[PDB]
Amino acid sequence: SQIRQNYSTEVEAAVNRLVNLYLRASYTYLSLGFYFDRDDVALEGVCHFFRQLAQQKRQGAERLLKMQNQRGGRALFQDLQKPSQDEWGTTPDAMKAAIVLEKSLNQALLDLHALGSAQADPHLCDFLESHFLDEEVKLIKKMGDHLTNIQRLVGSQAGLGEYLFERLTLK
Amino acid sequence: SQIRQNYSTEVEAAVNRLVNLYLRASYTYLSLGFYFDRDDVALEGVCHFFRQLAQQKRQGAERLLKMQNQRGGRALFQDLQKPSQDEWGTTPDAMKAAIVLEKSLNQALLDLHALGSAQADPHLCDFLESHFLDEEVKLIKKMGDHLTNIQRLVGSQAGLGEYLFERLTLK
Amino acid sequence: SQIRQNYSTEVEAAVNRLVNLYLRASYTYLSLGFYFDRDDVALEGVCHFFRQLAQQKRQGAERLLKMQNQRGGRALFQDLQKPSQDEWGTTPDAMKAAIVLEKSLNQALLDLHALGSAQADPHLCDFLESHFLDEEVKLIKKMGDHLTNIQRLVGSQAGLGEYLFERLTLK
Amino acid sequence: SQIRQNYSTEVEAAVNRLVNLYLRASYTYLSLGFYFDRDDVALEGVCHFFRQLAQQKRQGAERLLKMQNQRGGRALFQDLQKPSQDEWGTTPDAMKAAIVLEKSLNQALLDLHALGSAQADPHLCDFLESHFLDEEVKLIKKMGDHLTNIQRLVGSQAGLGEYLFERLTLK
């Protein structure tokens, strides 16, 4: 490559893997969203919450891909594994699954940051910090807040609590 | 002092003490606010309610300090004791603690007013009446209203009632 | 904690300490500001300069506290020690004290950054760089510029130089 | 009187005396203002500062007179004694004389307040607090600030300091 400079084959591979993880997360959120759109589930705010996450994760993948090309690396795509469930249970079940997913993405970001630091690749490290690391921390805090509120409500009386959370917290 | 007139050393000292009380109240409210911002507490309206009180109490202290200088007294600062709790329980626990705090501030204002009256210091007495005494009465009435509503709700079913109060009463 | 990830107990403690340092700095600046508001000191631009710093340091503490909750740490508050002086001398005395204070805050930031780096906590490191480290460097440069100008002026003729600095440099 | 109620002959007399004091203060300030307008004095900001005080003191007298009629008392006017000096010296001399004057007015207000309190006349006491007592405290603080600044400057080098105060502090 005529532009590649200080960009390790290790980081290039790891970025391609992280792209796959983000696209898989988007796919999971697509499935979550449409499950909550089912006539027998019917929680529109939950559907919207996950659909907006599907879009955010896809955008994250596209930013990674742009950066891959900016550095002179080569994007390589793999199969996207279907989401881990076909049906996602109740709002708390779904939000717990979302937190699990986000913590896995965050750990992948943290692992990639550690790799870039080992490889003395400060552009990579700055890229992750600026577009991904704080976005994850904010998102995980939001989901944790949501989970606490859902759990406070669905202890009290399950169906009613689920309805109220969707109506009064979610957009 | 070239400007000091009819301003007793007694009132000057008491004003410095009241400054400390107000700054301590601000600090208590800072702690209350961020406790309700915790991911495992997560009541945003309660957090906001106390954060706005933190600001109001700090502003009260600054008004007192301005007046101290206006009269030719000398501001003297002491340590600010940490708030009385590290964790603040449920919304009713917190609102009861807030009412306790405000009643202590109010009694300090009332004591200072009585001192000014004994000292024949009508400027002081007018200052307190105009900026502090009615502000306290209004705030304590609001907290009493809140407490009654919280108690009506958390008798019924605790978690749900707490959620509904935060969503439908608090900003 | 349901959200905590890659956040060391060491960093959590150090952040609580830094909160205390920032709130103490705010308190120092509160005292500085009102000393310059005294009828027998009467330098309004100096009062305003320090009052605005009081607000900036409080805001810094609140940002730290927000981040503590974002990461799943627990805010813990300690006593705030009173400022180191009751009377702050002349403008140069005060500005030298301010520079001392800021250098102590900066070193605490630098120490916390080093800790985060040792702990492989890139979010922390990015947080400090983005909101605190450059803010300190800019503030210390400004105070250094001020001190040089004050010293140029108060060599020439002390009272006059102090007046002119407050009127023509400070807001 | 068909409207007079709870208004002592003592307070009525004292209000007439206070009117005289305010009109005399206005007259003093008129003399101060035009002394600083002299071609051989020529400090326009000082002239303006005192001319605006002349107007404020006259307005204070008119408010007192309005209140006298509101309560059913009878305005009685006495000679206005000429001001105590024909020439007013330097800016610091003039500002010291102004502070002396204001402290005498303030003590007269405080004496009248004490009388109203003895006479159980809460309207009078509220009237003074609302329109006069805080106005005096603010004005005396301003003059004290001015005096400190003038003294800082005219120690350094008298003529220059006087010029700079008038140009950079006064309107």
XYZ file of C-alpha atoms in Angstrom:
684
model
C 0.000 0.000 0.000
C 1.110 3.492 -0.957
C -0.397 5.063 2.204
C 0.039 2.428 4.923
C 2.244 3.580 7.785
C 2.582 2.252 11.309
C -0.437 -0.037 10.810
C 0.205 -3.622 11.967
C -1.269 -6.676 10.306
C -2.450 -7.545 13.847
C -4.506 -4.395 14.206
C -5.806 -4.717 10.613
C -7.125 -8.261 11.391
C -8.567 -7.220 14.763
C -10.410 -4.288 13.123
C -11.998 -6.697 10.603
C -13.097 -8.889 13.544
C -14.542 -5.905 15.369
C -16.486 -4.971 12.232
C -18.040 -8.443 12.301
C -18.897 -8.059 15.981
C -20.582 -4.693 15.379
C -22.593 -5.995 12.375
C -23.643 -9.021 14.446
C -24.728 -6.701 17.258
C -26.748 -4.663 14.720
C -28.416 -7.899 13.559
C -29.211 -8.916 17.133
C -30.845 -5.517 17.697
C -32.831 -5.842 14.440
C -34.241 -9.145 15.794
C -34.930 -7.593 19.229
C -36.723 -4.667 17.636
C -39.042 -6.721 15.495
C -39.802 -9.175 18.324
C -41.169 -6.183 20.335
C -43.203 -5.153 17.228
C -45.081 -8.530 17.338
C -48.844 -8.169 17.962
C -48.488 -10.544 20.910
C -45.629 -8.539 22.493
C -46.579 -5.030 21.346
C -44.195 -2.703 23.237
C -43.524 0.074 20.754
C -41.010 2.014 22.879
C -38.921 -1.148 23.356
C -39.064 -1.849 19.599
C -37.881 1.704 18.899
C -35.093 1.518 21.566
C -33.599 -1.577 19.940
C -34.132 -0.432 16.329
C -32.166 2.743 17.114
C -29.384 0.541 18.571
C -29.376 -1.541 15.369
C -28.693 1.644 13.445
C -25.969 2.803 15.937
C -24.082 -0.484 15.732
C -24.218 -0.501 11.911
C -22.877 3.069 11.926
C -20.039 1.926 14.279
C -19.125 -0.832 11.765
C -19.097 1.714 8.874
C -16.800 4.033 10.881
C -14.421 1.133 11.491
C -14.465 0.284 7.788
C -13.769 3.894 6.847
C -10.797 3.905 9.237
C -9.510 0.568 7.857
C -9.336 2.213 4.353
C -7.889 5.466 5.831
C -4.968 3.451 7.240
C -4.383 1.346 4.140
C -5.769 -1.855 5.567
C -8.075 -4.188 3.673
C -11.639 -4.845 4.756
C -12.489 -8.533 4.851
C -15.967 -9.704 5.626
C -17.100 -12.955 7.233
C -20.472 -14.616 7.696
C -22.774 -12.905 10.161
C -24.033 -15.419 12.654
C -27.694 -15.228 13.374
C -28.698 -13.793 16.765
C -28.530 -16.084 19.740
C -32.318 -16.199 20.317
C -35.420 -16.206 18.081
C -37.712 -14.935 20.893
C -36.489 -12.475 23.526
C -38.847 -12.855 26.493
C -39.888 -9.914 28.590
C -38.442 -6.375 28.620
C -36.009 -7.256 31.466
C -34.858 -10.391 29.640
C -34.175 -8.322 26.554
C -32.387 -5.510 28.401
C -30.162 -8.069 30.246
C -29.252 -9.626 26.860
C -28.476 -6.111 25.510
C -26.158 -5.400 28.446
C -24.365 -8.737 27.901
C -23.922 -7.819 24.213
C -22.599 -4.332 24.980
C -20.148 -5.591 27.560
C -18.789 -8.027 24.958
C -18.361 -5.138 22.429
C -16.729 -2.985 25.075
C -14.262 -5.714 25.984
C -13.418 -6.115 22.283
C -12.767 -2.335 22.068
C -10.627 -2.510 25.208
C -8.704 -5.491 23.766
C -8.137 -3.599 20.476
C -6.970 -0.514 22.391
C -4.471 -2.673 24.345
C -3.236 -4.157 21.055
C -2.774 -0.668 19.518
C -0.911 0.463 22.595
C 1.373 -2.637 22.423
C 1.920 -1.872 18.714
C 2.627 1.841 19.404
C -0.297 2.899 17.114
C -1.543 6.144 18.655
C -3.953 6.947 15.799
C -5.864 3.738 16.517
C -5.894 4.415 20.215
C -7.228 7.982 19.668
C -9.803 6.734 17.134
C -11.302 4.256 19.648
C -11.316 6.735 22.499
C -12.989 9.471 20.453
C -15.757 7.407 18.731
C -16.338 4.159 20.664
C -15.113 3.950 24.262
C -17.227 6.791 25.707
C -20.203 5.862 23.532
C -20.113 2.386 25.133
C -19.741 3.637 28.677
C -22.735 6.014 28.199
C -24.855 3.253 26.594
C -24.101 0.690 29.294
C -24.952 3.228 32.060
C -28.298 3.969 30.281
C -29.112 0.221 30.066
C -28.164 -0.288 33.683
C -30.492 2.598 34.682
C -33.238 1.029 32.525
C -32.743 -2.384 34.055
C -32.956 -1.034 37.594
C -36.206 0.784 36.722
C -37.696 -2.237 34.922
C -36.805 -4.484 37.927
C -38.311 -2.026 40.428
C -41.531 -2.127 38.345
C -41.852 -5.784 37.474
C -41.297 -6.832 41.052
C -44.353 -4.767 42.004
C -46.771 -6.390 39.344
C -45.253 -7.710 36.084
C -47.592 -6.753 33.235
C -48.466 -3.332 34.596
C -44.810 -2.529 35.305
C -43.781 -3.482 31.784
C -46.504 -1.253 30.304
C -45.601 1.706 32.481
C -41.878 1.488 31.683
C -42.571 1.433 27.967
C -45.035 4.344 28.172
C -43.199 6.610 30.623
C -39.483 5.966 30.102
C -39.106 4.774 26.504
C -39.702 6.979 23.428
C -13.991 49.411 59.008
C -14.798 52.621 57.168
C -18.366 51.486 56.323
C -19.472 49.394 59.311
C -22.473 50.840 61.123
C -24.915 49.215 63.508
C -23.463 45.762 62.752
C -22.738 43.729 65.906
C -19.856 41.313 66.248
C -22.576 38.837 67.324
C -24.461 39.100 64.059
C -21.192 39.044 62.055
C -20.209 35.703 63.721
C -23.705 34.233 63.336
C -23.726 35.134 59.613
C -20.404 33.284 59.147
C -21.961 30.256 60.900
C -25.034 30.424 58.698
C -22.786 30.508 55.626
C -21.223 27.252 56.825
C -24.657 25.725 57.369
C -25.793 26.687 53.860
C -22.590 25.337 52.222
C -22.982 22.111 54.218
C -26.591 21.844 53.049
C -25.401 22.351 49.443
C -22.876 19.530 49.957
C -25.542 17.240 51.399
C -27.714 17.902 48.336
C -24.759 17.235 45.996
C -24.398 13.795 47.661
C -28.174 13.169 47.481
C -28.233 14.089 43.812
C -25.434 11.797 42.767
C -26.757 8.896 44.875
C -29.995 9.069 42.789
C -27.822 9.135 39.607
C -26.349 5.685 40.542
C -27.175 2.932 38.009
C -28.608 0.867 40.861
C -30.880 3.700 42.093
C -31.586 5.456 38.785
C -34.294 8.037 39.605
C -33.433 10.960 37.360
C -36.157 13.333 38.602
C -34.999 12.831 42.207
C -31.373 13.453 41.163
C -32.432 16.675 39.428
C -34.603 17.807 42.416
C -31.650 17.549 44.796
C -29.049 18.947 42.364
C -31.206 22.066 41.951
C -31.350 22.353 45.773
C -27.542 22.087 45.919
C -27.366 25.093 43.628
C -30.031 27.040 45.648
C -28.221 26.522 48.944
C -24.867 27.579 47.444
C -26.557 30.710 46.070
C -27.991 31.400 49.586
C -24.437 31.187 51.030
C -23.125 33.620 48.348
C -25.935 36.097 49.158
C -25.010 35.927 52.840
C -21.357 36.515 51.978
C -22.246 39.486 49.790
C -24.265 40.957 52.672
C -21.417 40.325 55.159
C -19.130 42.513 52.924
C -21.947 45.085 52.368
C -22.134 45.602 56.146
C -18.388 45.716 56.734
C -18.142 42.333 58.376
C -15.425 39.807 57.611
C -16.158 36.449 56.034
C -14.494 33.576 57.853
C -14.707 30.067 56.548
C -14.587 26.786 58.459
C -14.289 23.155 57.422
C -17.336 21.730 55.694
C -18.349 18.527 57.379
C -19.174 15.717 55.060
C -22.864 14.802 54.725
C -24.367 12.640 57.408
C -24.924 9.596 55.145
C -23.046 7.984 52.230
C -26.185 6.195 50.918
C -29.642 7.771 51.147
C -32.126 4.895 50.905
C -35.405 5.252 49.103
C -37.091 8.436 47.826
C -39.095 8.835 51.085
C -35.956 8.359 53.185
C -34.226 11.050 51.177
C -37.146 13.495 51.269
C -37.472 13.039 55.088
C -33.731 13.810 55.439
C -34.214 16.908 53.213
C -37.065 18.150 55.410
C -34.935 17.636 58.548
C -32.130 19.642 56.890
C -34.439 22.480 55.836
C -36.029 22.745 59.250
C -32.540 23.082 60.756
C -31.698 25.906 58.258
C -35.006 27.597 58.965
C -34.425 27.502 62.708
C -30.963 29.015 62.157
C -32.572 31.832 60.100
C -35.182 32.349 62.819
C -32.432 32.419 65.484
C -30.441 34.980 63.435
C -33.568 37.111 62.960
C -34.175 37.062 66.748
C -30.544 38.088 67.306
C -30.860 40.996 64.817
C -34.048 42.111 66.492
C -32.345 41.988 69.947
C -29.445 43.986 68.449
C -31.814 46.527 66.808
C -30.396 45.703 63.312
C -33.339 46.261 60.972
C -31.288 45.835 57.774
C -30.430 42.277 58.805
C -33.998 41.530 59.726
C -35.269 42.856 56.345
C -32.519 40.978 54.466
C -33.575 37.614 55.975
C -37.265 38.221 55.440
C -36.831 39.254 51.804
C -34.408 36.496 50.620
C -34.559 33.525 53.023
C -37.579 33.205 55.318
C -40.269 32.908 52.615
C -37.999 30.816 50.397
C -37.731 28.305 53.274
C -41.428 28.249 54.041
C -42.234 27.611 50.328
C -39.560 24.877 50.069
C -40.675 23.069 53.218
C -44.342 23.120 52.050
C -43.232 21.636 48.663
C -41.266 18.849 50.430
C -44.167 18.139 52.737
C -46.493 17.847 49.696
C -43.925 15.535 48.049
C -43.613 13.383 51.131
C -47.370 12.955 51.439
C -47.569 11.913 47.766
C -44.582 9.548 48.024
C -46.113 7.938 51.177
C -49.528 7.537 49.520
C -47.743 5.735 46.643
C -45.232 3.567 48.440
C -47.850 2.253 50.813
C -49.762 0.945 47.788
C -46.717 -1.003 46.210
C -43.183 0.322 46.865
C -41.209 0.040 43.620
C -44.070 1.033 41.350
C -44.975 4.000 43.563
C -41.402 5.263 43.556
C -41.251 5.043 39.748
C -44.555 6.823 39.274
C -43.648 9.685 41.623
C -40.382 10.276 39.811
C -42.029 10.142 36.368
C -45.214 12.111 37.067
C -44.345 14.628 39.787
C -40.607 15.290 39.466
C -38.987 17.114 36.513
C -22.362 -3.476 39.959
C -24.257 -4.470 36.834
C -22.348 -1.974 34.630
C -18.826 -1.864 36.082
C -16.164 -3.031 33.647
C -12.426 -2.470 33.644
C -12.731 0.042 36.508
C -10.213 -0.585 39.314
C -10.921 0.047 42.969
C -7.690 2.105 42.831
C -9.013 4.473 40.200
C -12.428 4.648 41.935
C -10.724 5.786 45.208
C -8.415 8.229 43.411
C -11.404 9.798 41.601
C -13.149 10.354 44.966
C -9.949 12.034 46.232
C -9.750 14.224 43.152
C -13.371 15.266 43.701
C -12.385 16.431 47.187
C -9.419 18.342 45.783
C -11.600 20.100 43.198
C -14.288 21.028 45.781
C -11.550 22.330 48.096
C -10.134 24.396 45.234
C -13.642 25.790 44.580
C -13.877 26.733 48.276
C -10.473 28.418 48.189
C -11.605 30.466 45.179
C -14.877 31.393 46.938
C -12.765 32.805 49.816
C -10.412 34.598 47.381
C -13.346 36.133 45.550
C -15.052 37.529 48.603
C -11.777 38.828 50.083
C -11.395 40.998 46.919
C -15.046 42.144 47.387
C -14.134 43.638 50.835
C -14.585 47.438 51.022
C -10.972 47.715 52.174
C -9.624 45.640 49.246
C -12.175 46.555 46.567
C -10.781 45.052 43.332
C -13.884 43.969 41.456
C -12.106 42.371 38.476
C -10.019 40.212 40.835
C -13.171 39.200 42.751
C -14.840 38.216 39.471
C -11.722 36.308 38.223
C -11.689 34.117 41.330
C -15.485 33.698 41.568
C -15.496 32.358 37.996
C -12.721 29.912 39.010
C -14.827 28.784 41.990
C -17.578 27.888 39.550
C -15.130 26.120 37.130
C -13.657 23.945 39.869
C -17.118 22.975 41.173
C -18.114 22.047 37.610
C -14.913 19.908 37.341
C -15.939 18.048 40.542
C -19.474 17.438 39.139
C -17.992 16.050 35.889
C -15.815 13.677 37.907
C -18.840 12.573 39.923
C -20.861 11.989 36.764
C -18.022 9.845 35.390
C -17.727 7.899 38.679
C -21.446 6.885 38.282
C -20.984 6.246 34.510
C -18.289 3.672 35.340
C -20.161 2.020 38.196
C -18.016 3.441 40.950
C -19.394 4.869 44.177
C -19.008 8.512 45.115
C -17.756 8.992 48.656
C -17.437 12.416 50.155
C -15.053 13.642 52.846
C -14.808 16.827 54.880
C -13.762 19.895 52.931
C -10.884 21.568 54.674
C -11.161 25.281 54.968
C -8.878 27.351 52.717
C -5.316 27.823 53.818
C -5.638 31.588 54.466
C -8.370 33.901 55.812
C -6.847 37.016 54.152
C -5.105 36.845 50.773
C -2.846 39.907 50.601
C -2.293 41.786 47.392
C -3.238 40.761 43.834
C 0.214 39.173 43.237
C 0.001 37.249 46.514
C -3.379 35.911 45.489
C -2.343 35.011 41.936
C 0.782 33.173 43.260
C -1.473 31.182 45.641
C -3.807 30.395 42.689
C -0.890 29.098 40.614
C 0.274 26.910 43.530
C -3.278 25.518 43.814
C -3.571 24.815 40.084
C -0.213 23.098 39.921
C -1.334 20.820 42.767
C -4.578 19.965 40.851
C -2.615 19.378 37.673
C -0.211 17.024 39.416
C -3.194 15.118 40.845
C -4.634 14.803 37.298
C -1.247 13.648 36.009
C -0.992 11.112 38.868
C -4.517 9.810 38.096
C -3.666 9.547 34.388
C -0.526 7.518 35.254
C -2.647 5.252 37.473
C -5.212 4.709 34.667
C -2.430 3.926 32.246
C -0.904 1.401 34.725
C -4.395 -0.113 35.137
C -4.984 -0.228 31.342
C -8.117 2.003 31.686
C -8.223 3.947 28.421
C -11.651 5.502 29.088
C -10.263 7.218 32.185
C -7.196 8.375 30.345
C -9.319 9.834 27.488
C -11.737 11.440 29.975
C -8.909 13.350 31.725
C -7.266 14.422 28.496
C -10.510 15.694 26.968
C -11.939 17.637 29.978
C -9.135 18.431 32.453
C -5.536 18.277 31.221
C -5.782 20.982 28.528
C -8.088 23.103 30.680
C -5.341 23.141 33.346
C -2.531 23.925 30.948
C -4.539 26.871 29.488
C -5.454 28.163 32.979
C -1.902 27.971 34.310
C -0.553 29.823 31.216
C -3.207 32.572 31.767
C -2.204 32.923 35.457
C 1.459 33.009 34.550
C 0.745 35.794 32.004
C -1.254 37.639 34.697
C 1.500 37.277 37.250
C 4.133 38.627 34.875
C 1.918 41.649 34.112
C 1.069 42.260 37.785
C 4.812 42.056 38.696
C 5.799 44.448 35.891
C 3.212 46.908 37.294
C 3.708 46.609 41.023
C 7.443 47.007 40.703
C 6.821 50.393 39.071
C 4.466 51.775 41.917
C 2.378 49.265 43.920
C -1.084 50.768 44.429
C -1.331 52.324 40.988
C -0.137 49.121 39.305
C -2.711 47.037 41.149
C -5.502 49.423 40.104
C -4.429 49.474 36.477
C -4.197 45.676 36.222
C -7.681 45.264 37.634
C -9.148 47.953 35.354
C -7.355 47.126 32.096
C -6.718 43.373 32.144
C -9.424 41.865 34.361
C -13.145 41.763 33.454
C -57.708 63.452 59.718
C -60.209 61.101 58.118
C -57.509 58.551 57.151
C -54.937 58.719 59.959
C -54.560 55.450 61.842
C -51.769 54.210 64.070
C -49.565 57.168 63.071
C -47.946 58.899 66.069
C -47.273 62.609 66.259
C -43.700 61.516 67.114
C -43.220 59.659 63.858
C -44.945 62.463 61.892
C -42.431 65.026 63.310
C -39.444 62.718 62.777
C -40.477 62.145 59.132
C -40.569 65.932 58.564
C -37.052 66.142 60.065
C -35.821 63.332 57.848
C -37.234 65.151 54.817
C -35.116 68.162 55.782
C -32.046 65.962 56.171
C -32.559 64.399 52.733
C -33.108 67.801 51.032
C -29.984 69.125 52.774
C -28.036 66.097 51.548
C -29.324 66.773 48.005
C -28.111 70.382 48.330
C -24.699 69.253 49.565
C -24.406 66.954 46.538
C -25.471 69.781 44.187
C -22.561 71.854 45.590
C -20.149 68.889 45.322
C -21.175 68.276 41.733
C -20.666 71.813 40.548
C -17.351 72.172 42.415
C -16.033 69.220 40.313
C -17.401 70.981 37.168
C -15.089 74.002 37.855
C -12.479 74.586 35.112
C -9.778 74.454 37.784
C -11.004 71.109 39.202
C -12.404 69.528 36.029
C -13.224 65.919 37.013
C -16.338 65.145 35.005
C -16.940 61.637 36.394
C -16.828 62.993 39.962
C -19.248 65.796 39.009
C -21.627 63.224 37.512
C -21.309 60.863 40.552
C -22.389 63.619 42.939
C -25.068 65.107 40.648
C -26.715 61.672 40.449
C -26.619 61.513 44.280
C -28.278 64.950 44.447
C -31.126 63.540 42.394
C -31.334 60.317 44.526
C -31.555 62.238 47.792
C -34.248 64.575 46.413
C -36.208 61.512 45.263
C -35.838 60.024 48.805
C -37.324 63.252 50.268
C -40.271 63.100 47.792
C -40.951 59.455 48.757
C -41.003 60.445 52.426
C -43.395 63.293 51.651
C -45.673 60.981 49.684
C -45.732 58.581 52.647
C -46.430 61.434 55.111
C -49.620 62.262 53.073
C -50.475 58.524 52.682
C -50.560 58.212 56.487
C -52.485 61.417 57.123
C -49.569 63.363 58.506
C -48.797 66.954 57.581
C -45.643 67.947 55.746
C -43.863 70.872 57.361
C -40.818 72.399 55.790
C -37.908 74.191 57.449
C -34.994 76.229 56.143
C -32.366 74.250 54.278
C -28.974 75.015 55.704
C -26.301 75.634 53.170
C -23.693 72.883 52.726
C -20.885 72.733 55.221
C -18.139 73.703 52.728
C -17.891 76.051 49.719
C -14.873 74.185 48.242
C -14.494 70.410 48.552
C -10.787 69.684 48.064
C -9.588 66.613 46.259
C -11.588 63.530 45.209
C -10.701 61.687 48.466
C -11.707 64.703 50.558
C -15.037 64.805 48.780
C -15.686 61.059 49.025
C -14.857 61.112 52.794
C -17.364 63.980 53.243
C -19.958 61.955 51.254
C -19.452 58.928 53.508
C -19.847 61.119 56.620
C -23.097 62.503 55.150
C -24.471 59.058 54.290
C -23.664 57.645 57.697
C -25.588 60.544 59.262
C -28.626 59.795 56.994
C -28.385 56.107 57.791
C -28.327 56.764 61.522
C -31.400 58.994 61.126
C -33.177 56.138 59.270
C -32.128 53.696 61.992
C -33.371 56.120 64.685
C -36.722 56.511 62.857
C -37.036 52.726 62.511
C -36.422 52.332 66.278
C -39.080 54.984 66.953
C -41.611 53.191 64.687
C -40.864 49.919 66.407
C -41.362 51.555 69.861
C -44.641 53.030 68.551
C -45.771 49.665 67.081
C -46.015 51.205 63.549
C -45.195 48.310 61.225
C -46.079 50.208 58.028
C -43.360 52.754 58.795
C -40.869 50.060 59.617
C -41.621 48.203 56.333
C -41.504 51.468 54.347
C -37.965 52.271 55.585
C -36.686 48.756 55.058
C -38.054 48.514 51.516
C -36.965 51.954 50.153
C -34.152 53.372 52.321
C -32.206 50.980 54.552
C -30.800 48.720 51.805
C -30.283 51.666 49.460
C -28.043 53.231 52.140
C -26.095 50.077 52.861
C -25.406 49.591 49.102
C -24.397 53.262 48.665
C -22.056 53.286 51.655
C -20.353 50.050 50.455
C -19.867 51.655 46.977
C -18.315 54.797 48.549
C -16.089 52.703 50.764
C -14.894 50.746 47.684
C -14.295 54.077 45.895
C -12.372 55.506 48.808
C -10.106 52.472 49.042
C -9.368 52.715 45.298
C -8.797 56.489 45.408
C -6.418 56.054 48.413
C -4.487 53.247 46.693
C -4.025 55.610 43.708
C -3.277 58.917 45.363
C -0.668 57.371 47.600
C 1.200 56.280 44.465
C 1.251 59.844 42.777
C -1.609 62.265 43.568
C -2.581 64.024 40.333
C -2.173 60.985 38.114
C -4.126 58.786 40.535
C -7.001 61.253 40.664
C -7.157 61.385 36.852
C -7.080 57.622 36.478
C -9.838 57.049 39.048
C -12.106 59.533 37.321
C -11.414 58.075 33.860
C -11.476 54.354 34.671
C -13.890 53.930 37.584
C -16.349 56.830 37.355
C -18.944 57.242 34.567
